[PDB]
Design a protein around this nucleic acid. Sequence first.
RNA 1: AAUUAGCUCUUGUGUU
Lengths: 116, 48, 661, 198
Amino acid sequence: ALETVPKDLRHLRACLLCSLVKTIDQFEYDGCDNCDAYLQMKGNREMVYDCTSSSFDGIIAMMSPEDSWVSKWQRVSNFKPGVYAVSVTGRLPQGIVRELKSRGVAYKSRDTAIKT
Amino acid sequence: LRRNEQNGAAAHVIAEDVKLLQFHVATMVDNELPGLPRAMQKSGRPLK
Amino acid sequence: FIQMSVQRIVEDAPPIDLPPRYLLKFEQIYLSKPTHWDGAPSPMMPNEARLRNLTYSAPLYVDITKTVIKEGEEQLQTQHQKTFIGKIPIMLRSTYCLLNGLTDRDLCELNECPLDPGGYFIINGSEKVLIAQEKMATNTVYVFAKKDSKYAYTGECRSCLENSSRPTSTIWVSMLARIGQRIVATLPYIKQEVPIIIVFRALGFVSDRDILEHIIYDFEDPEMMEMVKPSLDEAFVIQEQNVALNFIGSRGAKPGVTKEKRIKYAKEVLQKEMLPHVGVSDFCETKKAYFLGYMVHRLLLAALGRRELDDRDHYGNKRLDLAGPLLAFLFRGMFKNLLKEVRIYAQKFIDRGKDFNLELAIKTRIISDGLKYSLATGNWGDQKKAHQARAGVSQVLNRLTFASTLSHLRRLNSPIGRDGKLAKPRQLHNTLWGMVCPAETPEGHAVGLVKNLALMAYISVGSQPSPILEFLEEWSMENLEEISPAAIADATKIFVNGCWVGIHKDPEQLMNTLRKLRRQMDIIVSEVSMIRDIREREIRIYTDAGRICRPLLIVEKQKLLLKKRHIDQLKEREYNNYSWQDLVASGVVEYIDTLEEETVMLAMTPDDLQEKEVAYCSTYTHCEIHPSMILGVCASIIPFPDHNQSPRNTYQSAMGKQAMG
Amino acid sequence: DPNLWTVKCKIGEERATAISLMRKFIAYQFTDTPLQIKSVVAPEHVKGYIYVEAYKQTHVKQAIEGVGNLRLGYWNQQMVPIKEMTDVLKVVKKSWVRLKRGIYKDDIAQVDYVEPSQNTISLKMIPRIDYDRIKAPPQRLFDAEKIRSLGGDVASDGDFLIFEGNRYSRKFLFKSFAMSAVITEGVKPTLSELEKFR
RNA sequence: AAUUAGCUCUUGUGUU
Ligand SMILES: [Zn+2]
């Protein structure tokens, strides 16, 4: 799936549910490959700003989703291949989290960074 | 090395870090080592 | 160098290619007279260069073809004419120097001394001269016994084909002293050694009798086979070619972890690294097999004592490289660096898909600045790794007195490391008769290592051997690939520049014919040397550069070919047309080099040593012009040098370069 | 678990190497020569080499072909300790700030106004300028009269001045700088800078 | 009261 690949290294955002590194331009024009069935990112810039934040560290090139341990460690064995930020600092809005909870989605934070 | 061990502590870059530090300290007092690269500045000239 | 070697080196460079790519072919070098500049092209004169600290150099232009080929068959062979590369310095009074063909009045109008020999470069306003280096002859099998090793004998053979970027490769075939006599080979680019039989199997000769025929030519005296028996018996678990290939690749610089990688690496090193002078073509195993057979045969002959070991001091075994080869050596590396730089730039500018302009790609200072630095500082090599290679090849010309300059323009340097306890290289070998002055040498720490030419010594400039090969083939000579190995014993081998090519049955007629052709200068030029060994049925022909030679008069039976007609026509010289070159053309004088000088027999003076007295020789071939020509420049100003003690002549040769005048 | 290896690469260009490898693998996945790499790791401060997760070093060498960034590490690779897996994956972390780039690097800047646009913020800073006299320096108090006398690019609004570099100064530079172009956490000034601004 | 490296050349010791 080449569509997950960002077109440049300028102003990247990552999900707080997928931590999927991707341009804001692709988050608006293309949208997330795994949040589109639940939050409908395609078609709103402000929703992209709220959902995804630029404060991410490190990149992992998840190549084979069913054949890698790092995906199991990052809880992304069941997510699509692509570029994944190691840890994203932030929290999704209470409304988004509640809507995910009602729809059967558990909000598990990707903020694995060591806080001093 | 100090700023790496302050936060990172990757424990593998540390090996090369201390290896290069040991090499520099050793050559600062003995430039003629058996079977080691010589220390040179940006001229190709071995050091004194 | 300028006329031929630069063109040959620029064309011999391999094509550079790289999502389409280009072609970028280089051809037809162009060069002009020296010129400086903002300003218009104006001829810079050597005196002005000497006074303004300029560099007397000329730009180099080459024709380029850029052909970008992509999908759909749309390629453009755009040809750029006279593209600038860099500036090459010109040694004064060369064919490309401004002071060429100018008369005494012409030079005096230019504030240039007509007595100035030329022969030096002007770098940054300083007069530099290249001391001619000496080194060992290449493409020749040399057998030396060393007592500091495990090897009783070692037939070293260096090899280089023709000014190739690959450094010269050395083959060591050596016999252990100690069963016993384990013959081994120390291949280049391979860390460890290997028995020779493994190599012969690797080249593709499983048949044992074939290997013996290549190595041994005589099958009735069982001594060579007795010595080769242990070596043959050692290699018994390898019979097929590919297992030998694996064996050879197991010791390479990068041993491939798989067997296929080892086989490919071994076949590469066999067909492209060892023995490049005989050829690194697609297939040359038939001739390489014969050459290794001859090498092992010579090693066996050394073991028997039937052929005494070669001598390292004999200038029949050494070559003297002048400014030409040294500059070509520098230019190979400089051109390779330029090619790498332009390739890197083009590759970096084709990733974005844009078209790169070669005018901006080529960095001019790669050629000019490196050559200038190497000539100025004398460090003969790369600027970044100068300490690795030699130093002092270039020295400031010594303008103290005229004899000093003349002596310094004709100087030979032996690269033997100083502070050495060895005394053999410093001694005065018998072969330096008429070649190197026997009295002029530094008295300092480098006595005997720096020398000077004799008065009439000449150094061969080098010529292609292809006409020699064509003439030799179209005569009764039989090529090497189509001979029965049973015919080698009763035959005479033929070598050209060391490459064993062909065979012959009657060598006397061949040698006489070669002598007549060289006398007439029809096909064989004068500098070519032909030597015949009688004991070993061998004939060697040398055309390469670096050989030292001198003219000698010719004796036919007991009388000289020079007669009163020649002296009369030559006395009226500089009037009608007649000169020394015509003297050579009539086949009266001849250039003899030190290797051929073994087989010749000289008469010092005609009247004294050719008349009828108590019979001593009665079979002279050559006569000396004048024996006082053995002396050099500085030593030939000493009056009555044959009445002094020799050290005093040496001291005078030293102090004549310090006299005020 | 596939093994992890270190592949040498040019320092600073680790971000786009992963993207190029993705493009290679996606383009080659339909061809008869697919990339057999299982993952690629380029951490935030790991520079000079990239971690590759694949079953064998043979797969790594076969798959990393054609990438110029890793040509140094194409022939030789080192083994990543297995016990170091988590070591790969951990990251550790009216105000006053300091600018990051330009000629004004690593000096105190007082946050005067905070723009709610979250692109640039207002900073008061001491000009490190030569007043258009040397260029065709120590932190010193701005001189409006000298910069009006020396001339050149100058726009005057009493205490306000727009000068070379489109620099906005009042009375003391007051200009907008990006939040990512400054460090907003970890200054902790002393009394001397306060006078300037157990 | 204004520097260090490196290279080269050269002088004296070549008495018997
Ligand atoms: Zn998502």
